[PDB]
Ligand SMILES: *[C@@H]1O[C@H](CO)[C@@H](O[C@@H]2O[C@H](CO)[C@@H](O[C@@H]3O[C@H](CO)[C@@H](O)[C@H](O)[C@@H]3O)[C@H](O)[C@H]2NC(C)=O)[C@H](O)[C@H]1NC(C)=O
Ligand SMILES: CC(C)CCC[C@@H](C)[C@H]1CC[C@H]2[C@@H]3[C@H](O)C=C4C[C@@H](O)CC[C@]4(C)[C@H]3CC[C@]12C
Ligand SMILES: [Ca+2]
């Protein structure tokens with residue numbers, strides 16, 4: 054019935070018994086004397102000189118008595134004030150080559166110090182505002198920023214940090230959610246969120262416990278002052294060896310709240326940032342008192358950033374939809390729409406999307422069916438994600454009705470590539486590198502690293518294990534390149550023209566007469582050397598495919614899908630763009646290396662009134678009129694809606710040359726993607742739901758390209774000694790350009806904007822294709838893993 058000797062105990066007390074732990078207030082279950090015995094505030098949180106050597110008074114919040122280290126409850130400045138010691142922040146940076154842990158410690162503990170809404174740029178305020186944090190940052194390992202997951206809200210990001218999973222996989226797809234199987238709603242406030250049914254994957258504290266590594270309780274009732282959260286972690290670190298946890302978390306609600314109230318750039322942000330730094334100082338001084346400051350690994354990390362958003366910048370659905378009372382909207386910095394009643398027969402989600410599409414010239418949001426959202430968001434494969442999504446412009450809100458000087462000036466939740474949404478990462482301790490800056494990375498990657506830091510085997514997750522090995526002084530995980538599953542055929546020129554009945558045509562009979570004299574036509578030669586700079590992609594599933602060589606490009610032609618899985622080619626800085634001649638406009642040529650039965654047919658395209666075709670290697674970038682004939686082979690053709698061809702042709706005729714001109718040449722790999730069930734993974738044949746009329750030619754859901762060059766732009770892409778530079782895209786293969794409100798204009802006014810929105814990581818394409826890229830480079834495999842997780846954000 055009492056918390057005497059039980060405050061913040063790690064023991065698991067079940068109902069109906071009254072609790073004394075971290076979360077007892079959140080379940081309204083604390084013992085009667087919890088708030089007096091456990092939440093002591095008397096005399097504050099700092100020893101003063103007059104308290105040194107005091108007789109312990111149990112009413113005090115913390116202690117300055119000679120027994121306080123034994124009881125695990127000294128004020129964090131005890132040794133500084135009472136024993137002549139220095140504050141941790143005033144000590145020189147000194148390298149930590151190996152953990153320096155006291156007797157009985159079997160591994161370096163990990164402490165995760167999570168700060169809500171800590172925008173990356175807040176680090177610019179520097180040592181005068183945040184000296185402790187700046188010391189951690191400069192002395193340890195840090196990134197310029199860390200990318201959160203979408204939506205850029207607390208619960209999805211905190212659970213992603215904990216699991217290594219995208220929200221669509223871990224299940225916490227918003228701060229608010231409705232699950233139609235449960236027929237229940239989850240909210241940041243209330244009891245429903247405590248039900249385990251909502252939470253998938255395997256978070257770090259469970260991974261640890263299952264593997265015999267003791268975890269502290271990661272969560273803190275909001276009533277518990279930050280100073281007490283720090284003192285409680287320090288108390289647990291003082292426990293005997295068989296009770297003491299190896300992994301801990303601290304959470305602060307700041308600077309998110311001040312960001313919401315004052316906006317991210319307010320001068321009012323200074324004080325909350327000082328207060329957080331003061332708490333970091335208490336932790337570090339407290340660790341130093343326990344001789345753990347060169348033993349513990351500390352991660353300082355945020356969940357997302359903060360943008361300027363005021364009530365004046367609100368769009369209302371009632372200004373677009375005449376029947377707004379028939380819908381429910383999850384509102385604000387994103388929109389999710391569903392029917393207010395399932396019994397409604399009037400609600401048509403096609404009419405909703407149409408009514409929200411490009412209706413006002415300065416419209417500050419864009420509707421999408423969830424399968425059409427940028428694939429980089431990985432935000433579709435969950436029954437809790439409504440079919441209808443609104444991507445809201447940064448700085449704006451979307452609300453249902455106008456009834457919904459402002460009370461708030463900041464918010465977050467926007468697209469996770471937006472600058473204002475970026476957050477922070479610092480690692481400090483023996484296992485992290487010393488005085489080391491690392492490139493920006495995604496928070497999905499951290500679970501693997503935290504498992505490594507605790508000697509744990511990670512549960513399956515969406516990180517790329519090894520991509521963050523460069524953060525650590527000592528790695529225990531060494532990644533290995535996956536084995537190729539399907540081996541290609543290398544077919545020669547074996548068939549005659551007469552064997553093909555594809556209905557294809559090239560009246561004039563245009564032909565390179567010289568091909569009949571060219572015995573070495575379509576042999577390897579220097580094709581692989583010039584056009585496959587990083588080796589052939591490996592096929593990681595079982596299929597039948599052919600390698601096809603040409604002067605200007607190489608491809609891996611699927612005999613199952615009747616098109617390339619990948620097409621690879623290099624374009625020099627000085628390459629010339631040429632037009633398609635009049636006689637070749639509608640030219641498609643049989644490929645004498647590939648049987649008629651494993652080829653597409655032009656009659657399917659004639660009969661399909663909605664479908665046209667494009668080419669993966671562009672005829673516009675042919676090296677000669679002779680070589681241009683190769684680009685019209687049936688084995689280079691892919692099905693394309695006419696609307697999409699507007700995009701593709703601009704990319705191929707204009708942008709590839711632009712990129713080559715900007716980057717000292719580029720290597721391009723392009724191909725189809727099939728993701729009809731929107732799971733982010735390559736479809737099997739049975740999962741493909743649309744074909745070209747009357748044929749077995751499957752229709753891609755998307756088209757990708759990976760554009761690689763030398764990071765050292767003084768070297769051409771084909772003679773690069775060092776690190777690589779990559780940008781990639783996964784373009785939606787859509788039968789209209791409704792996504793692009795400016796699409797009636799010249800392609801120079803809209804196509805690039807579309808492509809930037811659909812930027813992608815090479816890893817995203819790998820999941821979607823079952824291909825493995827960059828298999829033959831001069832780079833270490835861990836460096837290649839970092840490259841494959843890179844996202845070009847265009848911010
Ligand atoms: C993000 O990571 C998660 C976790 O690894 C991936 O989800 C997992 O996906 C696999 C493959 O679809 C699921 O397992 C499969 O089960 C079927 C049986 O129906 C079997 O045929 C396969 O051999 C395989 O075992 C798995 O259940 C699922 N797990 C979780 C926890 O969600 C997800 O695919 C990743 N996302 C991306 C975009 O890579
Ligand atoms: C109101 C806030 C201050 C605190 C809210 C914390 C809340 C989200 C936490 C509390 C308990 C957590 C669950 C508990 O650790 C057990 C598991 C097992 C694990 O395998 C899946 C996650 C789950 C259900 C935790 C989810 C988060 C919970 C509910
Ligand atoms: Ca799929």
Ligand code: NA
Pocket residue numbers: 658659660661662663664665
């Ligand atoms: Na057609």
Ligand code: NA
Pocket residue numbers: 790791792793794795796797
């Ligand atoms: Na349009």
Ligand SMILES: [Zn+2]
Pocket residue numbers: 169170206207208309356357
């Ligand atoms: Zn948050």
Ligand SMILES: [Zn+2]
Pocket residue numbers: 170309310313465
């Ligand atoms: Zn917030």
